[PDB]
Amino acid sequence: KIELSISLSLDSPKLDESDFILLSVKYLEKSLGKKKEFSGFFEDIEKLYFKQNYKEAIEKILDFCKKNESLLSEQVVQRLAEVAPRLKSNPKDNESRRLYETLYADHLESVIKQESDLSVFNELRDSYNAVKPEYAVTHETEIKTLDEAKQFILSFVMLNDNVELPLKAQSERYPKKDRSREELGNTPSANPGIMKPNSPNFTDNLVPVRDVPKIAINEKVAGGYSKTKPTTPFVASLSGTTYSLMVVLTDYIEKHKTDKDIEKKVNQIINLWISSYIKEGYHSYSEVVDVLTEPFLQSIFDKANIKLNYGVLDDTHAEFRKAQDYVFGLTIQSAMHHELQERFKNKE
């Protein structure tokens, strides 16, 4: 039933680029079957997806199918080709991505659970307690459980707007942030992570109701992150609190320049920070990554030999599959919601 279930989904008007990718590979996964003749494909597509190289995957997807059109169905393939040139992603409505990313945070956070002896965080304490502005509070208790650690890494927000500024001055990307200053107020949501409060989610992934804040896009900013990266879910446009992490991290690096295991370690703090920011709702992936990736910041790492994974992980399939079904259903529903309504406009 995939041949039609998919075409029905393609019909959806609000199809993002993230979706075609997710849906297509599904048709291709199911129909082609698991023959390792093509397993190289799905693995790149699920890796490029994470890295937001959507167009590339799209090309590869279309041509994978061009070559294997005998095996597959032209009807889906042709459609995939008609809808593709026009696909676009609106940041404020990249719902599938917000599911992939909320869930990836957990995988990533679960990775660090096993990977870390929570040593680095008990040693980053000293660097924070030093660069802390006086108004802040020292951390003097042992960071033993990893939930204690999140609290710590998230208290680097206290250093903001004081110590963050010298490092922020050099960004050529931050000046393009689009959080509008309208203090539209907090709203409730029972949806996890970067997910939007009024958007569907699997009934298993529903955090208890909380008051998530609501933020807005200036949209008059030119070159705004949101317009440059329309492929990004927008919770606040960009983390300047990253710059505050980097104040601390620059210090850890200097203070522990010698240590052999520095690379691994810096990537437990950089990476947890990513998890927790996408988890607790503060920002998306590309809103933290795309500030740390800026050249000026990399010099700190490069000159101390730290190559950063940025949280790229070996397997993202779990979250690919789950997201595939999200779009599947969110999209077959749309179609139902249009037949339902062509049957109520066909009455009286």
Binding site: K1, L4, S5, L8, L184, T187, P188, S189, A190, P197, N198, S199, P200, N201, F202, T203, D204, L206, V209, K214, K322, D325, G329, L330, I332, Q333, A335, M336, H337, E339, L340, Q341, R343, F344, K345
Partner: protein, 371 residues
């Protein structure tokens, strides 16, 4: 080939087939087992009576209303309701007809799964879907976005729906419903000298309620019209033959809804609760919600529910708002009609949870397909 639909309701199970615009069969959702004395003496494997024969035989049985308050308490006494439904009431074999079911707003994550389990495991339904009754009701209105005030026997929920998703943050539950009103009418009618105290007597106070009772636009004007005139009074032929006269009691009872101080509840009325839920949504979506407030349920069938609710929610809300309370005429069975509709939709044929999928993913497939 038809798809069975079933409103696992609080007080009345309402079931039927897909093409139908009516629930073919409805019965009390109640199940009883003999209370005392082992009257099951000759009753071969009849240790349980479910349905219309559970109130027919009442003294003989101890009744446990499952699905009271809207969420399935006892799963063992609900399979029996489902047996009664498929085999005995609808005369169908579940294994041949797909089954849409209904779940209440806020069904715990867990309850949904056991439902998926029972159907596929106990009944071997070829396929299945579980849906929030309120979303379904809105679907009969022809709307994908709005707020439904679903009032029934034991639970009244206010479910704001945006793009088919019952927003869990807004759903508010008023555990006040029809039973409390049939019991209130008994109380108020008793103080007029009549005596309606027996469980048998509750069942004619439900007829008086449904047949005569109405919601007054202004309780105050209408309480007066009842003392300033005898027009409102109406007469009911009790089955004993006694003709009783019901007047101010006609609106007093349905008012318990808008002012539940009448039953000893400090809770907000159906009017405030609606607002308190529409105000638990983003400013952007409240607009459409006010303009699309569907009334579904049967305690919403009282004459005057709509006109009053506008009046009441246009008073708790902005003066520029387009408040529109939409009460379909068939609201008693709207949840089901919406479902009968969905089931007959073609696109829906792909939204079903097939047996194959159950085998592959287990009970939790419900979560991924039937959001």
């Amino acid at each position: 080939i038809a798809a069975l639909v079933i409103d696992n309701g609080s007080g009345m199970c309402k079931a039927g087939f897909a093409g139908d615009d009516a629930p073919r069969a409805v019965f009390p959702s109640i199940v009883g087992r003999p209370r005392h004395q082992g009257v099951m003496v000759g009753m071969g494997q009849k240790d349980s009576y479910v349905g219309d024969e559970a109130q027919s035989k009442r003294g003989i049985l101890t009744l446990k209303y499952p699905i009271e308050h809207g969420i399935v308490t006892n799963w063992d006494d609900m399979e029996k309701i489902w047996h009664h439904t498929f085999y005995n009431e609808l005369r169908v074999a579940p294994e041949e007809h797909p089954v849409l079911l209904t779940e209440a707003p806020l069904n715990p994550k867990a309850n949904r799964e056991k439902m998926t389990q029972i159907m596929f495991e106990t009944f071997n339904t070829p396929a299945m879907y579980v849906a929030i009754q309120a979303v379904l009701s809105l679907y009969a209105s022809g709307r994908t976005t709005g707020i439904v005030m679903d009032s029934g026997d034991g639970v009244t929920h206010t479910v704001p729906i945006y793009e088919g998703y019952a927003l869990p943050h807004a759903i508010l539950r008023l555990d006040l419903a029809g039973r409390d009103l049939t019991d209130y009418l008994m109380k108020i009618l008793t103080e007029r000298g009549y005596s309606f105290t027996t469980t048998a007597e509750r069942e004619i106070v439900r007829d008086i309620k449904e047949k005569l009772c109405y919601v007054a636009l202004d309780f105050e004007q209408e309480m007066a019209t009842a003392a300033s005139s005898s027009s409102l009074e109406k007469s009911y032929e009790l089955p004993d033959g006694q003709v009783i006269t019901i007047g101010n009691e006609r609106f007093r009872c349905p008012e318990a809804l808008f002012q539940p101080s009448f039953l000893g509840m400090e809770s907000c009325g159906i009017h405030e609760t609606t607002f308190n839920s529409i105000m638990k949504c983003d400013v952007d979506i409240r607009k459409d919600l006010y303009a699309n407030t569907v009334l579904s349920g049967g305690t919403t069938m009282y004459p005057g529910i709509a006109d009053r609710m506008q009046k009441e929610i246009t008073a708790l809300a902005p003066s520029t708002m387009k408040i529109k309370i939409i009460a379909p005429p068939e609201r008693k069975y709207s949840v089901w009609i919406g479902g009968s509709i969905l089931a007959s939709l073609s696109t829906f044929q792909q939204m079903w949870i097939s047996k194959q999928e159950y085998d592959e993913s287990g009970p939790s497939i419900v979560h991924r397909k039937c959001f």
